[model samples]
Target: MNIFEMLRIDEGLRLKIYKDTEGYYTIGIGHLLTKSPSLNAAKSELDKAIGRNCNGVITKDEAEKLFNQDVDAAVRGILRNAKLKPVYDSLDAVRRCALINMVFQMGETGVAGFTNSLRMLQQKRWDEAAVNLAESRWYNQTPNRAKRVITTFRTGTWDAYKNL
Candidate 1:
């Protein structure tokens, strides 16, 4: 089986909170809860992690760390799809981050399915690639996020949460 399938099998989807064999709090593909007394939002998040509180809160630092980890994983997954490069290697950092964001949201196979967009990106057709992504189903499903990424891809800017 391929990497994506293997990952799916190993980390079965768990939209809700669940306990492991050791009985610690876990959620969303095994995000473990550890102590962080100094962190303001840690306790609230810990409560949600262990208890039945699904609407938990996470500290800014924790969110950043988790997001970075997930993005790195997505980048690795994208790299494993050989056909998608030299596009992956050729792009600048901002564009790379845009693609990373795509992979994070869509998964490896889902992002790989964007053949036209990938080809446009590989050929350095930035506008076409951006438009392709903007017109994709993912864009329709997530307009604001898609716009942010596509804007970055097209304009080579980093407007993640700030104004574009």
Candidate 2:
């Protein structure tokens, strides 16, 4: 079974599923209704975004013939352009991915407004990253999604069960 089936998404998100350029019928991570090519585009994109190459992650250029640059921007660029209240260097790919993922779910402004978690990840504080994820306003907002992702990154065991 695919990860979507595992997540048990309802009709609202699944009804809009469409075949991406790679021919995979996918719904976006947490927003919108469309046949969207998910972030990461390729495993490498996922790895670069997350800062880990676990689970055979590969670069986008090598795998899919084409990818949605807009999706990538939503995940990374949105956060990059924001004026974080307590700005951080957060150049680390992993740290950036963590924040980007959150921003992907919650718009750049929503995620950028968060101070604690962003700061923690920027500081390279793993435990704090996990806690910040859980404690943030966005933590329980997405029906338990943010916490699950942060946990996966925190444990360093790379696996994609489902965003839900």
Candidate 3:
């Protein structure tokens, strides 16, 4: 599958508003309705698409469209860093998805902070890269998700994922 499908499995859909796992307001496919850069520009797009208020509800079509936008935004966040070009290019599609999935959850800036891991990844030192991830706060906060993505990075396979 593609990044979008993988993300759907990782971040499920909720057509109406629900507090996300972190207790922040969200709707659609994990679209944050809360602040911190006020990233809810897509919120307005969803309302406009559904011809409704900021009513905290949405149609499947609108939700699907916004999901693509979210992935695109996440991807741009990754590509925005010029220094990561070789690191990103060295990866195959599966490994790329793992990284982008990370960017989708944490910001690209957050994911990029794995200084040693990224260097290891650039060298295709899968186990070393995963070791760095395993010791991070994200591993504690989202153990299962981190494990799955880390597996994807280490193995370059989708075996750790579900709903394939």
User: How well does candidate 3 score on lDDT at residue 135?
Assistant: 93
* Native-to-model Cα distance after best TM-score fit, residue 65 in candidate 2, in Å: 12
Using TM-score as the yardstick, the better of models 2 and 3 is: 3
Provide the lDDT at 99 for model 2.
Answer: 49
The list of candidate 2 runs beyond 4 A from truth reads 1-13, 17-70, 79-91, 156-164
Model 3: per-residue Cα lDDT over 3-85, one tens digit each: 88888988898998776777676788877766433436555654765577866678888789878888998877777786565
| Candidate 1, 1-164: lDDT as tens digits | 22232223333444444453335444454454533333334446656544534354444444444545665678678788886556789887767767766676566788888889888987888888888887777788657767767877787765443442
Per-model TM-score, in order, reads 0.60, 0.49, 0.86
Report, for every candidate in turn, its global Cα lDDT versus the true structure: 0.61, 0.46, 0.82
Stretches of model 1 off by over 4 angstroms after superposition: 1-65, 159-161
Write down the worst ten-residue block by lDDT for model 3.
Answer: 34-43
Clash number by candidate, in order: 0, 4, 0
* Per-residue lDDT of model 2, residues 107-142, tens digit only: 577776766766765566778778766776555545
